[PDB]
Amino acid sequence: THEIASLHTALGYSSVIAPAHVAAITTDMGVHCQDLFMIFPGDAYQDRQLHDYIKMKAGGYAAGVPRCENLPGLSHGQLATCEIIPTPVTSDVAYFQTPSNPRGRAACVVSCDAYSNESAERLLYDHSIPDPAYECRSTNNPWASQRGSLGDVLYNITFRQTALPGMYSPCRQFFHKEDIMRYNRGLYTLVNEYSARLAGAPATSTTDLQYVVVNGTDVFLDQPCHMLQEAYPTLAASHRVMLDEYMSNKQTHAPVHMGQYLIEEVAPMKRLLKLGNKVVY
Amino acid sequence: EALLGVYTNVVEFVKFLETALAAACVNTEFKDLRRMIDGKIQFKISMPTIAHGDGRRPNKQRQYIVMKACNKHHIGAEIELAAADIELLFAEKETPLDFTEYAGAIKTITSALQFGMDALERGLVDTVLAVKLRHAPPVFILKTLGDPVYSERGLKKAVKSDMVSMFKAHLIEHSFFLDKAELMTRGKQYVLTMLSDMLAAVCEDTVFKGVSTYTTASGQQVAGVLETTDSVMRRLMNLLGQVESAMSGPAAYASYVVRGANLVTAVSYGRAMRNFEQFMARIVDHPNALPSVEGDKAALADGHDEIQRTRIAASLVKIGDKFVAIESLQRMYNETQFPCPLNRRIQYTYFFPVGLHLPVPRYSTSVSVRGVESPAIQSTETWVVNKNNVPLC
Amino acid sequence: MEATLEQRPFPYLATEANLLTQIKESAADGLFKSFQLLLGKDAREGSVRF
Amino acid sequence: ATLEQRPFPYLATEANLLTQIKESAADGLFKSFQLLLGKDAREGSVRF
Amino acid sequence: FFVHPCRGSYRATHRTMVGNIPQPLAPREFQESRGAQFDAVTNMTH
Amino acid sequence: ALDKSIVVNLTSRLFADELAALQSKIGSVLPLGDCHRLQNIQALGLGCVCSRETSPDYIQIMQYLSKCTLAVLEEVRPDSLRLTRMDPSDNLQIKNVYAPFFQWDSNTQLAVLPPLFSRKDSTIVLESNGFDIVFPMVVPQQLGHAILQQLLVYHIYSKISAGAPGDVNMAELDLYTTNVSFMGRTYRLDVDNTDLRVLDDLSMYLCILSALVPRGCLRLLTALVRHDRHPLTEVFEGVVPDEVTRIDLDQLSVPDDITRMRVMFSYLQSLSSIFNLGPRLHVYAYSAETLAASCWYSPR
Amino acid sequence: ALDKSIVVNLTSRLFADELAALQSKIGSVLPLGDCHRLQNIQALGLGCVCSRETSPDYIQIMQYLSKCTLAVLEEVRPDSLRLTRMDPSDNLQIKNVYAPFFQWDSNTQLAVLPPLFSRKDSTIVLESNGFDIVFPMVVPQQLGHAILQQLLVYHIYSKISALDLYTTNVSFMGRTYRLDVDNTDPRTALRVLDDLSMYLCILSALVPRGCLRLLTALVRHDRHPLTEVFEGVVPDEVTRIDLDQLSVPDDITRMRVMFSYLQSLSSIFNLGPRLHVYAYSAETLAASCWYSPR
Amino acid sequence: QAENAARLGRQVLGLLPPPTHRVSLTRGPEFARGVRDLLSKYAASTRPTVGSLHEALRQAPFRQPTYGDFLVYSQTFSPQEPLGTFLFSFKQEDNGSSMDMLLTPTSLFMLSGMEAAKAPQTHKVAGVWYGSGSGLADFIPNLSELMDTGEFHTLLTPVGPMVQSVHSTFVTKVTSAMKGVGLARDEPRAHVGLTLPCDMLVDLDESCPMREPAGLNVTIYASLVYLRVNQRPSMALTFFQSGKGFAEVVAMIKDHFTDVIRTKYIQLRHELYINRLVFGAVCTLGTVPFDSHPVHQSLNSLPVLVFANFEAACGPWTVFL
């Protein structure tokens, strides 16, 4: 045993880290959705014949590293899970090109007064106040931002960690009230805790599926989505045709057509999109 | 048939003080750290004010006092000695095969003892780097906090909202900056204004700023260490030359022993100074002397003035006027099969629609699309592009 | 036993570096734990008692 | 004013202090004492 | 959802059909375009 | 400071075939009738008591194991085996080579039990000396108190089916006894119903209890009436079945009832201890790939 | 390492009478009260609980014997007795001078019991000091149990009397013996019997039915050497219980609780401390053994 | 820098097991000179000094525990413990490689569900280390059914007192002590004694006197009692302290739980389930030497005893009734 004591003699921050070079993308950015049959095993329909019917239309550990045995091998990497938040058909598309929350209300608590939970809760929930993003509407979808809404019913669950490996949920961070109120404090207390504490329930790494890391040893990751409280849009195209317009000409591309649209991605990494042999950065 | 060669490894012994990481630290050897309860460093910051004669109420004299404390760390190791190894360590004056049975058993216990020391010397370089990685906030937070022009008035509600918009705008544009150098036609000057802005953002205001600790050849001043992986160090060493690649530094640690009059107060009371003798000559030997940096520097650099200076193999670089050493620590991590902490993973969240409507005055802007535009059509899926540029529905 | 701050009249030393940047804000939003402001009538060396 | 078992260099006296300690300390002749039995009767350790 | 008298509490029924979703949240120009999608799939004749 | 080693010599050299089987189990636990370092072959197995010519026994083995000294193989050299001595509360290592294979965990309590399964699973025959060494059945304590129990029930109903066919179903008997569930896992044991003569002595004892106990406890309640009767004995009158309390004790005389009550208790303490106490040892570390468990012996 | 020796100071010189009996039993095991070098004689005897004027109760005496530390004699000086000590877990020479003599061998088992055959033979009274000394008895466990088997049976059939050849005789291969009961306090020997009434009727409630049907198939014709207790006639009770049909998964849950209650009967039939002899000399009457408490 | 490696030359070679006493016969009667620790009576002088008896103090017996290395989730093992608690290892199935479940006695107070007034002090303390009690019962879904048939006492193997706990955010590393006195980590040359709360421990030797023998030994026993409260199954864990020998304490425990036995077996005059008949079990947690005073402490208050010179010697579970 060797004992070492360390002290910091400067007042301000004397060390700075920065991302420089992306080595490779681990997680496949594909289409696989989260299955609630596998996250919530208890709840079922009354008829066993009708509940076995719907399971036919949809569908553990191994030496410390958890594996799913339904897939024999994977070709595009670690497979990403997708949630589904029900949304009215009339929600505006102009919310979707700019980075924001998947609920209809902006949830940045950093702007609020320090140690004021009631003022911070009033930003998240109360609808006498139009959005900190928008002054026109109160909420994009009242199915997710409302107090007892289905967004707040499904995904405001604090993680419970069964003996089974358990699974990660991307939407759980944006809807969980108690993990958002942790950032209500002053700025420099949030900067001091940004790198020192690994936050509440992130995903695993080098697995088949995205599991929530229940064994935090030497997992190094940091994630800027908790602090800044936004989610970055990707390529969307309601038809195959309008994705061809984005790669023929990027400037004279039309974002909204009569029935269809396109969202150009705004992400901190800018990938090389190459379909065919035409390359659009 | 016969053997041709029997070849082994000799473990590359790298201690803490030979690496350039010790430019970011101040090393003092401390005999009995098992006996310490707490550390303490005590600041007293006297703040001057401008006197101006507008309609202000003028400020009186201000004063701040800052308390810092140590952080304990523990390192473990492991040695498993064999049963018969300890058993035949004792009997000898047997046949000459039992001498070489004996002499091959002392080789086992010494190579097991080098392993106990190497696994402890790697632990310093690990735990000192883990100290640095906890107190290292990223660029996009600290760049906008490192300029006083945004917060001269104070952090009210409208300034905080005005900085959150700037953490986002700096995270989208200026992230992965060395990967953006290929696509930019300007290129090698974009990285240099990015990386010198990382230099200007770090608080250079250290207590030991006047202490001489590292020098180059010809007495120039080393200021800071940037640490990368091997793949990034190939880039930055090609973009900027390794102008000198040898620095000077102390050969050993600074000693602190509790001998003398420190020992009486350590036993009688529960406390103990650091450098009691220099601390006594300020109070009782020569009182009422105002502190002046030209004559007070010898009491700051306690020990670290006049440690034997030796040549340190490094790799320096010119950034602005400030010389920066460049390290890479993969050789101390890939030989032990532990993953390097500078290799690092970043998670993003990807927000995404499917299946909307568009309102009653429908419009278009495209010149070239002939098909879909009928109002009876309804889109029930959206197309996403993978990591490998394969579109999926 | 945690380490605590104490206002005893220590013989303070002189550092070359300035410390004054962003101090007035860092009292309001805490950069560091365990500080104590001292305004004008009370910014002095306390009377030593033992 | 606190009692403490730090290993002081205790000084030696000519006079005895042993007359009626068993029933004076038990009936509280003087406040703030502590009795040490056996292996506890030792100058323990230093820790600053 | 609706409010039920007695403290009162919030109690619920179920929008059985699709059209019980109110028209600010499922408008009529959607809802008859959704009907033209029914018309094209089954290939019925008018 | 003390020296412990147990080195057994032989009269004849080993064959090349028999050497590979003891190299397979170079770590094992052998019972051993003597505490000294130099010793002959006839004690280090279980061939001193259990043999083919003698009738197979359970209880006389279990009487023997708690009286016996255990030892662990270190290195098998022809012809001199090298065991290591087991001490009270001494820390050492065990490799788990036993047929059939039960999986060990750390923080389990190993209980040395006699072998009641097949011959080729248990023993390794030494043809050079003509003597049989027998490796005991090392099984964890909760299995060993449950692998015993279902096989002892299977031995009883095998005795009923041989006396009358209509009382016992084979499919009901096999599926509920030969499959043993432990730690989430299932083990289908070798039945060896090819002809379980090990367990005939226990199946004689537990039945001779099972008739004499309800006849016995009637007389023991009624003889203890006091005003200083223990107040928990008033509660247990509701536990005994109603058909038990209707025995005419006028049928058995006093010179018969002294013989019963002495047979009553003398079987009990001879049967209580042979379920309870044998050489039983703890394990605090285990690894499945190395198959090596760090153990320590508690002699009781 | 460790020391073990107890030298017993004594306030009067012993007579040549009582010094001759002590010199005869120079190797003997007797308990004593406290764990110190210097010791009064009023802790050496077992007669602090087993006296003449007080009615002794051999269960409470035996219950007393598992509390105490045990000691072995070394020398009998005319002033001071000198004794060595038995501690866990220590190897020690032991020598039996115990007068109801049995034969031991190497790898035998032992146990310590109160004197249950002839107390006047096993206790010498000290007329000079006034305090008598009672020697306990060491017995191998087969006869160690079989004496406690008979003493529990005796208090059962002494209470029904409110004769002797069936209740006071301990049986063994080759010999028969007499237990010493004239004045026994039965109250501590009946609380043990009160707890036997607790275990035994719960064992009558969970009796496996297939095992009772095994006796209805056995004792009628299949006669065996160890089933001669029933004398060829079935009990009337066993025919009453086996009217039900047999089912395997009923008795599996029964035989586990049959098993687990037979773990409990060790607690009521315990001996005192145990002695595992690994080597015993025959003509010298010494041995070597390691003391194991509980 | 070799001066720092010369310290490992001293301290490793000085700290080894004593070697086997093996002397060749050609040397002579030198082997009698190598027997020093068997010598037990040292000479005293008119004024002995440490320079006279440094050789008498040099021979010490060879005492060493065996540690257990446990890797625990940080939700079960609370991040703050008094460093001498007793431990249990629950075990149901090997699911992963190394994730282990440990139960302090305040943690098993919450899984039980016993009432407040029967343990009035630790109910406040074990209610603040944990949630409502369902933060732990999600690991064992069978707690309603392990109590019915009575398989819970067969799944606990008592381990011994804590030594060190290295705590991280998601995973706590716990080092216990078996076989004896565990060596203290942070304070050097010290010995970790075993701490029990004053509420769970039920002392057993207590007299006016109104005389019992002294000895060397007193053994701490654990008990675990199957009962039913509010028509729901629940357990009860109590401790005992007596050096009376195992033949008495089983009779001494039945007098303690008399009223508990009386309330239960009223219920089975009406329904008799053979699984319900098993009542309790008793383990032996290891010996304490005679006349050691259990020193009272207080933590936040929670009164907590502490037993110096505790050595751990685990036994099985024997089913008393």
* Interchain CB contact of A148 with C (< 8 Å): no
Chains touching E by CB (3 or more pairs below 8 Å): A, B
The answer to whether the CB of B232 falls within 8 A of the CB of A20 is: yes
Residues from H in contact with G at Cβ < 8 Å: 37-38, 40-41, 59, 61, 149, 211-217, 219, 243-248, 250-251, 254, 272, 274-275, 277-278, 290, 318-321
Q: Cα F180 to chain center, whole Å?
A: 17
Put simply, the answer to whether A189 touches C28 (Cβ < 8 Å) is no
**Contact status of A89 with chain C (Cβ, < 8 Å):** no
Radius of gyration for the alpha carbons in chain E, expressed in angstroms and rounded: 17
The DSSP code for F14 is P
The rounded distance, in Å, linking the Cα atoms of H87 and H222 is 11
In DSSP terms, which residues pair with G112 in a beta bridge? G138
Class of residue F12 by CB neighbours under 10 A (exposed 0-12, middle 13-18, buried 19+): exposed
The answer to whether the CB atoms of B42 and C13 lie below 8 A apart is no
Q: What angle do CA D37, D39, D44 make, to 5 degrees?
A: 105
Q: Which chain A residues in 38-77 lie under 8 Å from chain B, judged by CB atoms? A: 76-77
Could you count the other beta carbons within 10 Å of the beta carbon of residue E8?
8
Identify the CA nearest to F273 among candidates G265, D5, E21, B17.
G265
Residue C49 CB contacts under 8 Å (≥ 6 apart), including other chains = none
Rounded to 5°, angle at Cα G197 from G193 and G198: 115
* Contact list, B89 vs chain H (CB under 8 Å): 19
- For residues C26 and C33, give the distance between their C-alpha atoms in angstroms, rounded to a whole number: 10
Rg (CA), chain D: 13
Query: Across the interface, do C38 and B279 touch by the CB < 8 Å criterion?
Result: no
Q: Do chains D and C touch (3 or more CB pairs under 8 A)?
A: no
Type and span of the H or E element at F63:
helix F59-67
With beta carbons less than 8 A apart as the criterion, state whether G204 and F240 touch: yes
Q: Which residue has the tokens 């001490």?
A: F87
Q: Kindly report the three-state secondary structure assignment for every residue of chain H.
A: CHHHHHHHHHHHHHCCCCCCCCCCCCCCCCCCCCCCCCCCCCCCCCCCCCCCCHHHHHCCCCCCCEEEEEEEECCCCCCCCCCCCEEEEECCCCCCCCCEEECCCCHHHHHHCCCCCCCCCHHHHCCCCCCCCCCCCCCCHHHCCHHHHCCCHHHEEEEEEEEEEEECCCEEEEEEEECCCEECCCCCCCEECEEEECCCEEECCCCCCCCCCCCCEEEEEEEEEEEEECCEEEEEEEEEEECCCHHHHHHHHHHHCHHHHHHHHCHHHCCCCHHHHCCEEEEEEEEEECCCCCCCEEECCEEEEEECCCCCCCCCCECCC
Sign of CA dihedral A153, A159, A163, A166: positive
Cβ-defined contact of C21 to B46 (cutoff 8 Å): no
| Residues in chain G within 8 Å Cβ distance of F69 | 278
Do the Cβ atoms of F8 and F81 come closer than 8 Å?
Answer: yes
Q: Residues of H with CB below 8 A from G266's CB? A: 318
The structure tokens 């039983």 sit at F280
Q: What angle do CA A98, A99, A104 make, to 5 degrees?
A: 90
- Distances in Å between the alpha carbon of C10 and those of A201, B43, B279, C7, C42? 47, 10, 9, 8, 16
Q: How far is F180 from chain G (nearest CA, A)?
A: 12
Q: G222 in helix, strand or coil?
A: coil
Cα–Cα distance, H288 to H239 (Å, whole number) = 14
**CB within 8 Å of A79: residues ≥ 6 apart:** A27, A28, A30, A32, A71, A208, A209, A210
Q: Is A90 on the interface with E (CB under 8 A)?
A: yes
Q: Does B149 touch chain A (CB under 8 A)?
A: no
Paired with G132 in beta bridges are none
Contacts of F164 in chain G (CB under 8 A): 217
Closest CB to C19: pick one of A11, A188, A192: A11
CB of H139 within 8 Å of a chain A CB? The answer is yes
What is each CA distance from B20 to B24, B137, B303, in whole angstroms?
8, 22, 20
The pair phi, psi for residue A207, each rounded to 5°, is -125, -175
Across the interface, of B357, B360, B378, the residue whose CB is closest to E37 is B378
Residue G270 and residue G73 in contact, taking contact as beta carbons nearer than 8 Å? no
State the Cα–Cα distance between residues G137 and G135, nearest whole angstrom: 7
Q: Which residue pairs, CB below 8 angstroms and at least 24 apart, start in F217-220?
A: F217/F244, F217/G197, F217/G200, F217/G201, F217/G203, F217/G204, F218/F244, F218/F245, F218/F247, F218/F249, F219/F249, F219/F257, F219/F261, F219/G156, F220/G156, F220/G193, F220/G196, F220/G197, F220/G200
Contact call for residues B205 and B66 (beta carbons, < 8 A): no
CB proximity H22 to B under 8 Å: yes
Which residues make beta-bridge pairs with H220? Answer: H241
Resolution in A: 3.7
- Based on DSSP, count helices (H) and strands (E) in chain F, helices before strands: 8, 14
Residues of chain H found within 8 Å of residue G198, distances taken between Cβ atoms: 321
Beta strand B62-68 with B41-47: parallel, antiparallel or unpaired? antiparallel
Q: What is the CA radius of gyration of chain F?
A: 23
**What's the half-sphere exposure (Cβ side, CA atoms, 13 Å) at H234?**
17
Chain A neighbors of C32, CB-CB under 8 A: 11
Q: Within the 107-136 window of chain A, which residues sit less than 8 Å (CB to CB) from chain C? A: 114
Count interface pairs A-C at CB distance under 8 A.
Answer: 19
Residue with tokens 């595992």: G276
Q: Do C31 and A114 touch (CB under 8 A)?
A: no
Q: Is H96 exposed, middle or buried (0-12, 13-18, 19+ CB in 10 A)?
A: middle
Cα–Cα distance, G250 to G253 (Å, whole number): 6
Hey, are the CB atoms on A186 and C30 less than 8 Å from each other? yes
**Is B362 near chain E, with CB under 8 Å?**
no
Are chains D and E touching, using the cut-off of 8 Å on CB pairs and a minimum of 3 such pairs?
no
What six digits make up the tokens of D39? 């292996």
Q: For residue A198, which residues of chain H lie inside 8 Å, CB to CB?
A: 169
Report the Cα G183 to chain-centroid distance in Å: 19
Residues of H with CB under 8 A from a CB of F: 18-22, 37, 62, 66, 68-69, 89, 91-94, 154, 157, 159, 178-179, 254, 258, 261-262, 265-266, 268-269, 272, 277, 313-314, 316, 318
Read off the amino acid at residue H182.
G
With 0-12 / 13-18 / 19 or more C-beta atoms within 10 angstroms meaning exposed / middle / buried, residue A142 is: middle
- The three state secondary structure string of chain B is CCCCCCCCCCCCCCCCCCCHHHHHCCCEEECCCCCCCCCCEEEEEEECCCCCCCCCCCCCCEEEEEEECCEEEEECCCCCCCHHHHHCCCCCCCCHHHHHHHHHHHHHHHHHHHHHHHHHHHHHHHHHHHHHHHCCCEHHHHHHHCCHHHCCCCCCHHHHHHHHHHHHHHHHHCCCCCCCCCCCCCCHHHHHHHHHHHHHHCCCCCHHHHCCCCECHHHCEEEEEEEECHHHHHHHHHHCCCCCCEEEEECCCEEECCCCHHHHHHHHCCCCCCCHHHHHHHHCCCCCCCCCCCCCHHHHCCCCCCCCEEEEECCEEEECCEEEEEEECCHHHHCCCCCCCCCCCECCCEECCCCCCCCCCCCCCCCCCCCCCCCCCCCCCCCEECCCCCEEC
C36 in B contact zone (CB under 8 Å): yes
Nearest to F89 among H157, H159, H179 (CB): H179
Q: By the CB < 8 Å criterion, does H96 face chain A?
A: yes
Per the DSSP assignment, residues forming a β-bridge with H158 are H88
Chain G, 151 to 180: residues with Cβ < 8 Å from chain H are none
Whether the Cβ atoms of residue B247 and residue B222 lie closer than 8 Å to each other: yes
Region of residue H282 (left: phi > 0; alpha: psi -120 to 50; beta: else): beta
Asked if residue B316 lies in contact with residue B242, where contact means CB atoms within 8 angstroms, the answer is yes
Tell if the CB–CB gap between B155 and C29 is shorter than 8 Å. Answer: yes
CA D15 to chain centre: 16
Tokens read off for B250: 């102390």
Task: Indicate if the alpha-carbon torsion angle B289, B292, B298, B300 is positive or negative.
Answer: positive
Residue among B173, B371, B181, B210 at smallest CA distance from B304: B210
Q: Do H20 and B15 touch (CB under 8 A)?
A: no
Interface of chain C toward chain A, CB-CB under 8 angstroms: 19, 21-23, 26, 28-32
Cα nearest neighbour of F240 on chain H: H269
Lateral strand order in the sheet of B41-47: B41-47, B62-68, C35-37
User: Is the C-alpha dihedral spanning H108, H113, H114, H120 positive or negative?
Assistant: positive
What is the least distance, in Å, from the CA of A280 to any CA of chain C? Answer: 44
Residue A215 gets the label, from left (phi > 0), alpha (psi -120 to 50) or beta, of: beta
Distance between first and last Cα of chain C? 21
Q: How far apart are CA G278 and CA G288, in angstroms?
A: 6
Nearest-neighbour CA in chain B from E5: distance (Å):
38
Distance from CA of B185 to the nearest CA of E (A): 48
Q: Kindly determine whether residue E34 and residue B360, on different chains, have CB atoms separated by under 8 Å.
A: no
Per the structure block, which two tokens stand in for H190? 């010290």
Write out chain A residues lying below 8 Å of B184, CB-based: none
Sequence spans of domains, chain G: 1-140+269-294, 141-180, 194-268
Q: Which residues of B touch A192 (CB under 8 A)?
A: 135, 137
Rounded to whole angstroms, the Cα distance separating G196 from F273 reads 16
Q: What is the DSSP letter of F15?
A: P
Which chains touch A (3+ CB pairs under 8 A)? B, C, E, H
Question: Are G6 and G68 spatial neighbours (Cβ–Cβ below 8 Å)?
Answer: no
Residue of G200, G211, G218 lying closest to F220 (CB–CB): G200
Shortest distance between the Cα of G179 and any Cα of chain H, in A, equals 22
DSSP for A177-215, written as a single string:
HHHHGGG-S-HHHHHHTTTTS--SS-B-SSSSB-BB-SS
Token pair 């096999």 is found at: F174
**Which residues does chain H have within 8 Å of residue A216's beta carbon, measured at their own beta carbons?**
168-171
- Classified as helix, coil or strand, D36 is coil
Please indicate if any CB of chain B lies within 8 Å of the CB of D48. yes
